[PDB]
Amino acid sequence: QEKVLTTCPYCGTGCGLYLKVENEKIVGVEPDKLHPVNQGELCIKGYYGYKYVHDPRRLTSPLIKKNGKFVPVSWDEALNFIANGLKKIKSEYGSDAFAMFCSARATNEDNYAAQKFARAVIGINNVDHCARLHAPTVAGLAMTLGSGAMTNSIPEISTYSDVIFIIGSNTAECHPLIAAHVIKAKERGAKLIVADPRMNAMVHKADIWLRVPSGYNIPLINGMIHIIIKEGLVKTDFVKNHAVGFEEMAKAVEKYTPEYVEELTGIPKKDLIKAARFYGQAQAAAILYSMGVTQFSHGTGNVVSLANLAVITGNLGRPGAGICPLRGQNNVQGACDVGALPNVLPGYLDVTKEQNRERFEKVWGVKLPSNIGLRVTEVPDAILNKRVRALYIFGENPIMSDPDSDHLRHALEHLDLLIVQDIFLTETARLAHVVLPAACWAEKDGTFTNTERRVQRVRKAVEAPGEAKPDWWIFSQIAERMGYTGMQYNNVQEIWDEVRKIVPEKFGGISYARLEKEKGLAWPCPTEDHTGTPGKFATPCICDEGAEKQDFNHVIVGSIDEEYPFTLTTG
Amino acid sequence: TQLNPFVVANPAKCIGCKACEVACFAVHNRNNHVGATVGTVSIPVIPRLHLIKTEHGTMPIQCRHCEDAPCANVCTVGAIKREGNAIVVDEKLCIGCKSCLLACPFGAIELLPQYEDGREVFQINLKLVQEPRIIAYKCDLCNDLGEPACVKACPENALTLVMPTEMKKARNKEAALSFLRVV
Amino acid sequence: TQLNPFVVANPAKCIGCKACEVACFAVHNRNNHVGATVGTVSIPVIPRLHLIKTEHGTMPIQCRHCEDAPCANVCTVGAIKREGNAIVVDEKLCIGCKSCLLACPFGAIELLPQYEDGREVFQINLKLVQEPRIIAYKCDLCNDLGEPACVKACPENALTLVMPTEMKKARNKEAALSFLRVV
Amino acid sequence: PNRFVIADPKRCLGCYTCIAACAFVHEEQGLQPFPRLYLTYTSEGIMPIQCRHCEDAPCAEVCPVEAIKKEGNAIIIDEKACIGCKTCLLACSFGAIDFSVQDSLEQSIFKDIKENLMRIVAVKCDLCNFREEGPACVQFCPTKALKLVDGDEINKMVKNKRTVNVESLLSVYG
């Protein structure tokens, strides 16, 4: 009867989705024929992910733990309890009493509000998200190219035939529509080079299979680079115009030979020669990599090598070619543009520099701390050491997906005050202290930032069950109860306008009118009339660094038995 | 676009010793447990060039690598492809439809059983025993491997690799010099 | 083992008179009470080779009897076997799974109702009427009967039975004689 | 003759969308909620397998209650009269029949969806003849791997291949 445009929240690709609603309840989901990403077809989660919003077990009222059992309790006295608990812990031991766990499955306004109401209300740099476990990738790409995110745009990989190079192939079952473009790229001219230690559904369609054992892909790429250098397929103009040198990399790449990797990894010799030839003679090359490479301990130098391979060839900053990091959640990129890490500020600004702090005093509100906060891997140590008093589990269940679950479960017996603004079927809330109902993707009005840095909006279709309310008004109530200068969150539009105002250099033209007219925009976009950057990100030149010139880092093979002869992996 | 080179034999000096076919067999089956010695070859012999002897002596004939190749175009399945400068048949997609033998007039293609990993390749549903897989064999210029083994295996070095630009230029130069030396 | 012979057509001498399909239909349906005379035929006509026409001529095509036959590999029941020198279909184990139509690139197999003893065969349990039984049809080189009947019925002798081994020898001899007469 | 559906393994990601759509359409219609299209993993390639509608069935010849019958242009199970005598499971060459039991589901995303959402009889692809649209499996596929073949598309493909072969043989060498 009524159709509402929305972005599918289940993975990071982002797709148009009409939520066919009838009698206030969702009855179906439809694809958008004019969307540039999915082109009118969705995976399993898009077609049958709407049966999650009206389960009979949805949390419909606030409850609190008085004597060990939760009791149905109205909102205002629960907010009183939260306010007095935060006030007493802040009076006792200061502002370091909590670490903020903002969800990776919430809109960018949620993360911005959480950061502000943890920094401009009490004041601490203790904000984290459970999507860090791709953390070295953003560090490596920033140190190599000066770019901290995706470079190219997804639909360009199928407009014309290119060479697609996959590292740790799991795209066939992690993003079931990006691999749809890769398969659809085969217009009798797209040519695939795949490298992974396992058997997937994508390698069986690959003309060339670079099956290499886990942890041995750095020698593989080093031998690949050695082959493409020995045959003289290096674009000399690109390296002589924008790069700082060539012989420094040559001093560390010549030690690996095709025979060396032949005896080291157990792969045929003609495959590497072939794959190097197809990468070299072709003018278009896109490097995909799935979760497999990103769950490795030594991924820093590996992604550095992946970026520098594209640097030495010249397939960067051009349409149809470029490196392609992939994110595993809808709003991971929404946890980096705004501050969700203990050493970042909205606008990709580092809090360690006083210039990034002195630019906002009154436009932000209360004065901010200048110290680096607590990381997500360090706050269990503070819980065991009793150095932190509270924790904010928001919109997620960090007791199952995160590794080493038993340590966190044993750490969770530190019950002084716990706030879980979450949804049904979470054991953390059962182990928590205070539980508050929240709102899902179809109940909010916010924005999603996909892996391809495209910004779309979420439009509310169904009304909330019971007293479940969006978190913005929860945060505003808490801040007003403690006492905040002014009163925020009149609507989501004011919050997004404030985001546009605070950082106009990155995105100041991402308003509701353009997203209503256009099919989403991708930052940077410093003005309203600009059409966005993408398949360039910012590089047309490899000069996103402050020095306007990229550098290199020399790589080396690392180190890891009879007791455990079998390597265990997961996806 | 470059003209495909092709090896050719010299009937004037050829003896018919059949020492170039065996080298071709040894160099093509390097993945079938061969150690450049007799006794390690437990598989039958399959050559690529074929020797024919008639009243005007003996000569080996092989694939000329036709520019307007009929063998590639008649092949409906698409087994024969021009991957490099030379023409090479692919053994993965070939089904044995003998129409190639209706195309090539020289006749350098033979349908023979396949052999991999020192064993004969069996099929799924054929006849009660199973039947061998028959594949197309022809010369592929040894572009995938190194320098062709048919060269420097002949005792008198009869067969030579020629590509028709240098031969044409040499013949034209010789004709011009002979014409100018008389006038 | 010996390579399976297959009948081929010469399009330059064929007219399209459709006198080759009729002979094949007559010679394979002796159990359906035909006496080499129109009027005793109480069965719909089904031939084995099929004639088509394009702008550049007319000819029939038929089964090429591929050595690595895709139609035999696709069939999971195993009705298609190489009973003799040729490859044949069995009408007793066929179930009608049309996947063999998706395998043969030449399209020489057709799924049609089976006719025996002058009457249409009927399946036991299907729908209220009884559904007919459908069997594949393709050239089987007349192995059970005598010489191929498509040949000796064509007025222009466009149809020829070829042996893919002797023909290669003839082509080799002709190529050698042509090359040696010039050198 | 009969209409069926075929999936070339060149463009099948194993994304489990067709399987879930086939299950849920049959669930919301009022039939068994179990999928009738099985994903199989092999050494070289992944292809969904369903009931290629055999023109002699080898199924209605083994059913003792006469439940399986030809309707329209397909083979229909007629679930109401089926008793569970696992005889058609022996006589199916491709293995296109599974039985409506919870343990018949392999561990995958579809199992997680069906357990977070919430008679034993033989279920078979009925080609979605009750729906005015085409088959659900061919319609929801992200890469359009599956395709429905009719009685006339087979003839068109056969004629196209035959004409291409004849024209190539004429053009290249007689």
Ligand code: SF4
């Ligand atoms: S690809 Fe991702 S965003 Fe698109 S429909 Fe599937 S789960 Fe939703």
Ligand code: SF4
């Ligand atoms: S025998 Fe092999 S190469 Fe020759 S036409 Fe048939 S498939 Fe092609």
Ligand code: SF4
């Ligand atoms: S196989 Fe025969 S027709 Fe084909 S390129 Fe070689 S010589 Fe020419």
Ligand code: SF4
């Ligand atoms: S070039 Fe190679 S394949 Fe051809 S005849 Fe000589 S050795 Fe054999």
Ligand code: SF4
């Ligand atoms: S090795 Fe030389 S002499 Fe002997 S058959 Fe070959 S070409 Fe002739």
Ligand code: SF4
């Ligand atoms: S129709 Fe007959 S010959 Fe064809 S695949 Fe089925 S059983 Fe085999």
Ligand code: SF4
């Ligand atoms: S039916 Fe077709 S595929 Fe099978 S052997 Fe005959 S020509 Fe080859």
Ligand code: SF4
């Ligand atoms: S050889 Fe026999 S079966 Fe084949 S087309 Fe001729 S008459 Fe028919």
Ligand code: SF4
């Ligand atoms: S009988 Fe001979 S001439 Fe007549 S249609 Fe058949 S092949 Fe052509």
Ligand code: SF4
């Ligand atoms: S919908 Fe298509 S791609 Fe997905 S599993 Fe089914 S056949 Fe494969």
Ligand code: SF4
């Ligand atoms: S299980 Fe059902 S369909 Fe199969 S034979 Fe028994 S009654 Fe017939």
Ligand code: SF4
């Ligand atoms: S269940 Fe199997 S044997 Fe029966 S009709 Fe379907 S594919 Fe054929």
Ligand code: SF4
């Ligand atoms: S046609 Fe319908 S019942 Fe058959 S597999 Fe496809 S969706 Fe399932």
